[PDB]
């Protein structure tokens, strides 16, 4: 970990300024959190005069051509050397015009080795090596889950239900009947899975319903999807010599990268990780939510909702089941690690570069969920009697009932009415984050005291699977506006959902991931590009 002399020996050359995109992160004032992507899109093409090298790698071998300008900055197997503006990060939202400089930053993960020096064939071979006799996925399970992920007419109502539950605990056990009817319908409609994009939901499914109202040949899918995560979590357990906690952190966090705590998941739904994260102090971690640190606030009702709040404040959806005491998390530690595993190791296995993190409009979905039409009947009758809420007579247009009819889902009136209980815990908005942790006791050299990382994340967001631009039954940018957080979760079709899309930006978006420069760039991140490229262009039996 000796790179100080190398940097001192590189900066002797004047400057080699070519671009500024992949290596510049800027803090944003807490302005709008939905129009930030607007202010970023209109500026983006100015940030890329030429093509960024890091986006499209050089080649398999042309990296070793005798004149190319990439060998000049590949001289250590554990660091990255790039150019960047001569500013302190984070900086202003408008990119400056100072002379460039050569920085450096450790590849925290071996997976960050560029492809030309660690080919995809070898990685898949190492995988297939580790995979023998550990645990597998029955063919029916993987077939169904792939069908779900790769389906292009996924019923929008399920995304609606996801956004209205936002991973609480009470509201799920409240809507259990509706969720069960929906799952049953979809499985008997196409033989797929449901809600697999959300981790907390797939956990809840098998921890509550399980042995109950799901069919025997369907719940096996939701059990496999969790026992496989369990096996993957047990994997690192036997690749660590039992040692002594070094930097107030157990060894398992030092060996792996996911098992660490200071690495925030891509999608959170409470302060459960935030509290645990601040628990350590040796490598001072700093969090920034639009500039404000944060203010832990409790559940919010219809009485005081204020969709327009923009400050730094996150919610705990009915913080607990019982307690209602001050300031305590309501989940174990390993929960966040299991979420990290699911989203960094299994989602890109099936999606293969289709999924994209979406910011959701909480106002319109709440407006919609209320406007339900149900007549007054003492006893339920079934879908045949015209008094049923799904019979064509009472399908008043632009309602919520018509959304349910669009998906051929079969529900009852009482289960529909249950939706009213969402009114006990709102969800104000979805807001970006920006973690900032210094390298741990491993890369803790004097020459690395200040080379900290920068990774962003969304709170109360949603990960949608495959974009459906070809349907008209709903406006394009009705509910979800795209917010890609990491290079794995950034497709280019979801940019169409955003209103007022440029003519040039969409053309030059297939070849570059679209992470906004207030959500961490590619170099300053802890999961660099090449792992995403691997996941997207490899082919290894999923």
């Amino acid at each position: 970990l000796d790179v100080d002399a190398t940097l001192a020996a590189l900066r002797q050359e004047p400057a080699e300024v070519q671009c500024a995109f992949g290596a510049y992160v800027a803090d944003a004032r807490p302005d709008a959190l939905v129009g930030l992507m607007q202010r970023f899109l209109e500026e983006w093409p100015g940030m890329m005069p030429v093509r960024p090298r890091w986006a499209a790698p050089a080649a398999a071998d042309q990296l070793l051509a005798p004149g190319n300008a990439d060998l000049r900055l590949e001289l250590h197997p554990a660091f990255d050397f790039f150019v960047a503006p001569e500013v302190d990060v984070p900086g202003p939202f408008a990119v400056p015009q100072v002379m460039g400089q050569v920085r450096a930053m450790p590849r925290i993960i071996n997976g960050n080795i560029p492809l030309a020096l660690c080919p995809v064939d070898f990685r898949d071979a190492r995988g297939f090596e580790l995979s023998v006799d550990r645990h597998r996925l029955a063919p029916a399970t993987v077939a169904a889950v792939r069908g779900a992920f790769r389906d292009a007419n996924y019923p929008m109502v399920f995304y609606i239900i996801e956004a209205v539950i936002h991973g609480s605990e009470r509201t799920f056990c409240a809507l259990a009947r509706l969720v069960a009817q929906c799952i049953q319908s979809y499985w008997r409609n196409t033989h797929n899975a449901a809600f697999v994009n959300n981790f907390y939901m797939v956990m809840y499914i098998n921890t509550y319903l399980g042995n109950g109202e799901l069919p025997e040949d369907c719940a096996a899918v939701y059990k496999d999807l969790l026992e496989h995560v369990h096996a993957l979590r047990r994997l690192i357990g036997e690749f660590t010599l039992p040692g002594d906690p070094l930097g107030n952190q157990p060894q398992e966090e030092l060996n792996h990268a996911l098992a660490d705590a200071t690495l925030l998941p891509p999608l959170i739904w409470d302060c459960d990780p935030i509290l645990y994260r601040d628990g350590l102090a040796e490598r001072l971690p700093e969090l920034r939510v639009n500039g404000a640190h944060f203010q832990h606030i409790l559940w919010v009702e219809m009485a005081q909702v204020n969709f327009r709040n923009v400050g730094g404040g996150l919610v705990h959806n009915r913080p607990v089941r019982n307690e209602n005491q001050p300031l305590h998390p309501h989940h174990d530690a390993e929960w966040s690690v299991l979420s990290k595993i699911y989203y960094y190791a299994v989602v890109p296995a099936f999606s293969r570069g289709n999924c994209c993190t979406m910011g959701v409009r909480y106002d319109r979905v709440y407006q919609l969920v209320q406007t339900m039409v149900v007549p007054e009947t003492d006893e339920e009758v079934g879908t045949d009697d015209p008094r049923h809420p799904l019979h064509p007579r009472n399908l008043v247009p632009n309602s919520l009932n018509v959304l349910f009819h669009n998906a051929c889902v079969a529900v009852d009136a009482d289960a529909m009415l249950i939706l009213q209980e969402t009114v006990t815990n709102m969800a104000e908005r979805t807001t970006p984050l920006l973690a900032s942790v210094a390298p741990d006791a491993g890369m803790a050299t004097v020459a690395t005291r200040d080379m900290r990382t920068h990774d962003g994340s969304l709170h109360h967001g949603l990960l949608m699977m495959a974009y459906q631009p070809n349907d008209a039954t709903l406006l394009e940018g009705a509910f979800f506006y795209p917010a890609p957080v990491n290079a794995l979760f950034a497709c280019a079709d979801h940019l169409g959902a955003m209103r007022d899309v440029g003519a040039e930006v969409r053309a030059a978006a297939q070849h570059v991931p679209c992470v906004p420069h207030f959500l961490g760039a590619n170099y300053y991140a802890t999961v660099r590009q090449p792992v995403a490229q691997h996941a997207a262009q490899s082919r290894a039996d999923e």
Binding site: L368, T371, L474
Partner: protein, 91 residues
């Protein structure tokens, strides 16, 4: 409603008679080019009017017809417009 052996006798006055069954059955019991062409044109219009009249008569007993496509928005700021798939609305 007319005689088939003469095309010059069809017009809006005689085609107003009844449903397309009368047109087709009249044409069924048969036994320069501008004449037959104009006659074909007025006959087309007449059968279209007959068909819309038939649909009126049968639609007096059917469900109301919703707008199929969303995005048609005037009071959009309140409600989000949502279309309807006309998969089946039979009565």
């Amino acid at each position: 409603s007319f005689d088939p052996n003469n095309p010059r006798t069809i017009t809006a006055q005689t085609l107003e008679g009844a449903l397309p069954v009368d047109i087709l059955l009249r044409l069924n019991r048969a036994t320069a080019h501008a004449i037959v062409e104009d006659a074909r044109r007025t006959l087309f219009i007449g059968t279209s009017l007959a068909l819309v009249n038939l649909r009126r008569a049968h639609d007096k007993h059917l469900v109301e017809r919703q707008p199929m496509f969303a995005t048609s928005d005037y009071s959009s700021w309140a409600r989000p417009t949502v279309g309807l798939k006309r998969t089946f609305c039979p009565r």
